[PDB]
Write an enzyme that holds these catalytic residues in place. Sequence first.
Site, PDB file in Angstrom:
ATOM      1  CG  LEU A   1      -2.346  -0.631   0.986  1.00 23.65           C
ATOM      2  CD1 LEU A   1      -2.292  -2.094   0.583  1.00 23.65           C
ATOM      3  CD2 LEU A   1      -3.167  -0.470   2.242  1.00 23.65           C
ATOM      4  CG  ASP A   2      -0.418   4.732  -1.604  1.00 18.11           C
ATOM      5  OD1 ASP A   2      -0.929   5.769  -1.135  1.00 18.11           O
ATOM      6  OD2 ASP A   2      -1.008   3.992  -2.418  1.00 18.11           O
ATOM      7  CB  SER A   3       1.729   7.886   2.391  1.00 15.76           C
ATOM      8  OG  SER A   3       3.069   7.446   2.255  1.00 15.76           O
ATOM      9  CG  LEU A   4      -2.049   9.314  -0.916  1.00 12.40           C
ATOM     10  CD1 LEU A   4      -2.352   9.489  -2.390  1.00 12.40           C
ATOM     11  CD2 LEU A   4      -2.238  10.620  -0.181  1.00 12.40           C
TER      12      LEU A   4
ATOM     13  CD  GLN B   1      -0.794   5.331   7.985  1.00 14.50           C
ATOM     14  OE1 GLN B   1      -0.888   6.472   7.540  1.00 14.50           O
ATOM     15  NE2 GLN B   1      -0.729   5.074   9.281  1.00 14.50           N
TER      16      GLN B   1
END
Lengths: 178, 126, 53, 76, 88, 170, 55, 99, 221, 62, 459
Positions: free
Chosen positions: E42-45, E47
Amino acid sequence: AFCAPPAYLTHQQKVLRLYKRALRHLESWCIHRDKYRYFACLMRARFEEHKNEKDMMRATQLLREAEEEFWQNQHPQPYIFPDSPGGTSFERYECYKVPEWCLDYWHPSEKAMYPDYFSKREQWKKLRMESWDREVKQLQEETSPDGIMTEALPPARREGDLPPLWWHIVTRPRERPT
Amino acid sequence: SKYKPAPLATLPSTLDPAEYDVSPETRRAQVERLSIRARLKREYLLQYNDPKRVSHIEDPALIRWTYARSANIYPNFRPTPKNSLLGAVAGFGPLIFWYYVFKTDRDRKERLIQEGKLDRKFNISY
Amino acid sequence: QLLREHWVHILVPAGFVFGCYLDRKDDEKLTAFRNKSMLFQRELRPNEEVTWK
Amino acid sequence: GKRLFVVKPSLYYDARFLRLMKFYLMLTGIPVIIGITLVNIFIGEAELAEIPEGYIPEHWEYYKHPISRWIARNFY
Amino acid sequence: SDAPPLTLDGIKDRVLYVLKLYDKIDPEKLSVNSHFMKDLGLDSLDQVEIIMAMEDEFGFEIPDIDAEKLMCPQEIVDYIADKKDVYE
Amino acid sequence: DSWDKDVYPEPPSRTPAPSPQTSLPNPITYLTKAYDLVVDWPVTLVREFIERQHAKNRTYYYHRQYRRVPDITECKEGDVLCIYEAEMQWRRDFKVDQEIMNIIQERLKACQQREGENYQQNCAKELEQFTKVTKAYQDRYLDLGAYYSARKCLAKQKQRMLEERKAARQ
Amino acid sequence: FLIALELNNLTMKLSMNKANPYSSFSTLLGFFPSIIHRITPMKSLNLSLKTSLTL
Amino acid sequence: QWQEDPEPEDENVYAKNPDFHGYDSDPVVDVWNMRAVFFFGFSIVLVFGTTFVAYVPDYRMQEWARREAERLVKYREVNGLPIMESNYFDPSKIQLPED
Amino acid sequence: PNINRFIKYLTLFLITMLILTSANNMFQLFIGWEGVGIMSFLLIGWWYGRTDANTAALQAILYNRIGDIGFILAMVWFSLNMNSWELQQIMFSNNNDNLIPLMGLLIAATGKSAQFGLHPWLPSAMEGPTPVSALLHSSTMVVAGIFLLVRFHPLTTNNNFILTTMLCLGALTTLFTAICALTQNDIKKIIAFSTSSQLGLMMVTLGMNQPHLAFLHICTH
Amino acid sequence: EPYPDDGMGYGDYPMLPNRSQHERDPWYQWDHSELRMNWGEPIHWDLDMYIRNRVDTSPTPV
Amino acid sequence: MLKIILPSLMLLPLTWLSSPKKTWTNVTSYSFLISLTSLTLLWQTDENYKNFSNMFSSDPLSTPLIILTAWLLPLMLMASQNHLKKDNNVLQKLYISMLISLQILLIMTFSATELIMFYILFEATLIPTLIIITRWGNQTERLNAGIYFLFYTLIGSIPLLIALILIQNHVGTLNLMILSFTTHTLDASWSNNLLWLACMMAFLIKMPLYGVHLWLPKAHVEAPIAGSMILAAILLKLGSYGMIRISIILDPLTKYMAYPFILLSLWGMIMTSSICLRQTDLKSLIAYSSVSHMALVIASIMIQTPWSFMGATMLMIAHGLTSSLLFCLANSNYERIHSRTMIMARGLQMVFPLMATWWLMASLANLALPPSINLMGELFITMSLFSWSNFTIILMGINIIITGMYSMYMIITTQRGKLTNHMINLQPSHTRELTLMALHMIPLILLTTSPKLITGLTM
Ligand SMILES: CCCCCCCCCCCCCCCCCC(=O)OC[C@H](COP(=O)([O-])OCC[N+](C)(C)C)OC(=O)CCCCCCCCCCCCCCCCC
Ligand SMILES: CCCCCCCCCCCCCCCCCC(=O)OC[C@H](COP(=O)(O)OCCN)OC(=O)CCCCCCCCCCCCCCCCC
Ligand SMILES: CCCCCCCCCCCCCCCCCC(=O)OC[C@H](COP(=O)(O)OCCN)OC(=O)CCCCCCCCCCCCCCCCC
Ligand SMILES: CCCCCCCCCCCCCCCCCC(=O)OC[C@H](COP(=O)(O)OCCN)OC(=O)CCCCCCCCCCCCCCCCC
């Protein structure tokens, strides 16, 4: 709350904070869940289409413009969770968050009402008394002689040891004392 | 379509232009401020979590603030024409203003009473 | 030994009695208008010799 | 159940002060209040009367309540 | 009466429930120690959206610094338990 | 009743006879009968017991009367004895006048509450009495000051009589 | 009732509309609490400390 | 440095005497001081003094002034007299100046 | 843990409210008025660990104290000109110029009933617990200024300027508070601005010579 | 940076920025949690005016 | 009066002859008995004044002050017997002797019938409070505070002595009743204006008037608790009593000469209430509140209305009680945390519930909650001032608003809010200090129940 803020927020952290705040204000405007999901997917699409920027000066400019747009289009009364600051239930039970050291001033009759609890309290006090000297020595060892110092704290690094300054963290009052 | 900051409605720390045009000098200044903050926090937390402490924690910042607000003002006061004028106005102007207000009101009342044009209907306990 | 060890408890009552006596002395000192006031000028009853003491 | 200890300050000293204050206040006032009720029920409440001719009343005889008359007779 | 207490197993079950309702996470590879970027990809957005979903479930917000510290469902469960004082 | 209708006048009550058109019972009458039988009877019993105890121990008190000392008008200035006597008499009369004003005001309030919607017409004589006694009180006691005295009252009366005499010249 | 029902159905309708000064004025209580509760305590307490006590 | 004594630290007085009443260090004098303060302050002053003040009669001639006012009102109303004369003093006994 | 103290505070407020309602003289009216204000302060600042609750209680005290200034002006004028605070001598004061005492009573009513100018302390005072909000700021305390003007309506009927300014003030505050209530999100805030709008309607009803309709609306509302 | 030497008794006391305690981060554990201030940091000359029970200088949406 | 003066005199040999383990108990008990004896001055069944002797007399104005002094002596002993536990025995007995001498001299001053004896006892009361402030005060600035207090009072009181000797030469006796009966109207010349200022400025200094009030905050801050109590509860009222006594022979020129002092009083009460709003010291806040209340008393005495005199007397008694209570509560917090900072101790409602109740009741008395005698005095002062001029209601209303504001601000910042958990040295409560708060609050309740005792000379 459980982590100390750094010296400055990096660009990625500023962008993520803007994204979360924008989603919260978008939900405050949209109210209904399906409408919120639609417009939140649109906002995610905007952030994704501006994600791959390599100059980083244009990225900071886009962040500034997006922040200006957010301040123009923010909800005057955004939704706040009740326990969150500015909420209705924020700091409601601080009148009941009595610190643990009043039991030191309790009368022996009131202590006699609760024998086992006060025995365990004395055990915790003895543990604190030994651990204080141990952790003061550890914190003196861990401190850098000079340079950069942050508010992060070391853990216990040996067997039979406790983290430094653990008392006010472990023995804090409960969020719902009654 | 622009937020205009005020002394009573300040500029957001995410809207100020100084945040986006950063400099290494500002970065190292922020790091030094965090270092000072961390040193003070470490000292306070040691004093706070010390179990042998049997008293409150003294705050030299609070002591300095109270001393500056109370006992340092007259040692650090110098008479200037501006504060002389301000003190004269703030010490006499309200007094002269309320003097003229009360003098005019009571002179009018006494004139009306002496010429009989003021009627005291049921004023018996003054 | 109670009179020896608690003799300090009579000083204030002694002062109170002495003050009452001195007040009586001032009352009998100021008797120039006893039954001579124009408000209370009354004839003496046969069983009394002063209006007030 | 799963009941937890509730941290409270020392209410013992405030409770003790209130108990002692009420104890001494009751210890004198309850005899005083009982005496007031007994006096008002059984005796006193002197009624207004015309002064008989040739009679010089005592000063306490000008007062109404029996306790007031007693104090004015004994001490004034 | 009202407001039943939280348990560690209940918090874990609800966190895994939300993560299974997330479309980008296949439920067969989801574990309590699955890292969002290491083995979930996944990525920061994503998360941030996960943390907002947890806030929407449990009715209180996580502050931003702790939120960006949280990176696995076990970490989220431990944070919820530490905040709500769930000892068992 | 220790009071008298000469100083606290009260018109006789004119209550109308009940004329119940409805067949429903009156809960007010039921509650008043029950209230009498439950509350009024034991209260009047214990009050009769208290009254007979007072009759067993009956005492009397009198109302003090002061003879008229010479007025301050015949007191020589600097003679503090007769000046003191006249000043005490004046203070006594001042207190009596205060209570007279209290009596008149209480009478006016009773008139207003009794008349209710007709107070603008049926309290004409009470309001006239209040106005006259207020005018007399203002003529004798107003504007004397905190250190009011017989000397100040006499000076005010002399000034007022001088003004009236000068107005009576023309 | 009918006007408010139509407006609530419009809020149900899937479209973001730009905010207006009328809605901002209504939501922010006519700006009376913000404006007055910021200008009058500030002037009063600042006048107190900066003039009476100190000066 | 000058040989100055260090700062004394106030100990928890309740630690050695949990029934401390605020008056003295040893318990006997402390409890007797508490009993004396309560007995001579509350019991015999706040009760007996209150009763004495309550049963002071005719305080500054309140009820006497009321009774005398009622008597004068009755007299002047049954005799047709004014309730209050406008002049306190009789004009016959006042000698006005000629001019 | 302090449910007994909560109940005792509600009982004390009810006692002071009934004193204020049933008082015959303006001093006893003031006793009930200020007791109601202080119990409102305590019940708003019930959760005294909340800074916003303490701030709301303090600002309610402030606006009510401005109302108290108006009340004291009216009380002093009536003491000086009619020698009593008794309503019967006020009825005898019905037949002269009552501009200053009626203006003071209007200021007191504005402060207590949260009309325009002195309004926001009521929706701020929603910070207390919900039974406090209900009893205090919805049914009993906030109608005390309306009750005061209903009480002094025989004076109010002979002053046209007072009637006109009461009508204008009530219309302005009911319009403004309904507008504020249109876009709120807190349900307690919505019904508090609704309460203020109804109080403005009662002030309109007092602006007309209909005090009994205002009291009937007090009961129904 | 101290106050300018206008002879108003400020002395060497610093000129902290005129922002109230509402602008402080509410999620941080301040040493003085009610005051939102840490231990040892300089106190504004108008803290008693800028406390959270008093004058607010927070940014507004308009 | 001698039956009150003599056993108060005998308190000193009791103090110096009692055992060190019995001195506080014996002196407190016999001073309570002294107050109970002093309650017999309320037996006033006639319009006359209780002229006990040729040099002592009782008044409807003097009697509440005497009773308040006799009541405040045991309360001062209870307040001061905690910070003297780590003290020498002879110094403790000397402190008790200073308090007893203050009580004796104040009783004699209020019962004096002759103005020269009034001035002699005025200075006699000036001495031991200076000794108390200078010797048992805490900080360094107690010496400067004592100098300011002593010399403000002395520079005030010297022209008072000159004026009293002038009036004695002109009239003959300087006896209060003789002056009250053979009062002569002054012809309103410059000499009479200076005579007026000479005989009023001492009392105006000790009231204190605005602009010359600078001795009071530092004296009350640096004083010990008993000194603060006796100052704020008796000595300002002594100045007001002197003003009421001396104003009877100043007619008619007080009518126009009162103008600057009324303006000073009104604007100074507004300014000092603003200082209370912005004040960082709790004892300073209480001191400036005292300045504002005494400014109200000054304005009432200057306008010389019977309502004003009654309101002045009621406000004197009420403010004495509530200011002593506020000082005792502040001293309890000071003996806890060893600081006088306003904002340092915040959440004390949590740890001290009954003491928070006493704080709340004291502050409600301070902001004149009805039907208390505080509101009685303030309301009747407002009525008389509005009769004097209708525009004074603006200044009165501003003062009332700021008074409620600083009182509730004190309550919120000292009791409400989050608890300062670092203050580990918060002992629960002393029965002594809770008793002290009760002995302050209960007479306020009783005088509220019967306000006819403290109406004063006019009614
Ligand atoms: C606390 C304030 C202190 C300062 C102000 C004190 C009051 C100011 C006004 C009064 C003048 C001074 C006191 C005079 C006392 C006697 C008054 C009297 O008897 O008057 C009638 C007398 C007049 O006497 P007479 O009444 O017999 O007049 C005779 C009149 N014929 C002939 C018509 C019958 O007035 C005086 O004698 C006044 C002379 C005063 C001269 C000395 C003044 C020195 C300075 C005074 C202040 C000093 C302290 C402050 C210093 C600065 C501090 C910052
Ligand atoms: C059933 C319910 C009943 C309720 C009752 C309520 C009231 C209770 C109290 C009743 C008594 C009240 C006080 C009465 C005396 C007041 C002071 C006084 O007048 O003292 C003078 C008097 C001496 O008498 P004298 O003045 O000479 O004249 C007598 C007749 N002409 O002096 C005396 O006569 C002295 C004896 C009377 C006073 C007793 C005092 C007791 C102690 C308290 C005061 C402390 C005195 C100093 C220490 C004494 C220690 C023993
Ligand atoms: C004189 C100068 C004083 C200076 C300070 C002295 C301090 C030391 C005091 C020591 C003891 C002396 C007490 C003095 C006051 C005595 C009170 C008293 O009993 O007054 C008499 C009164 C009945 O008198 P009466 O004539 O009926 O009243 C006028 C009606 N014509 O009696 C009564 O009404 C009964 C009173 C006792 C019964 C209990 C009353 C409880 C009242 C509760 C009130 C609750 C609300 C309070 C609100 C406060 C707000 C801040
Ligand atoms: C058609 C005709 C229309 C006519 C319209 C007429 C309008 C008239 C308006 C009159 C009233 C104006 C003044 C009102 C002041 C109210 C101040 C107040 O309560 O502020 C509260 C504020 C904090 O509250 P806030 O920020 O709103 O909410 C907290 C959320 N975190 O701040 C605080 O809590 C600060 C704490 C208090 C600080 C001290 C304040 C002292 C104020 C003294 C004022 C003296 C003068 C008063 C004059 C009144 C005249 C009516």
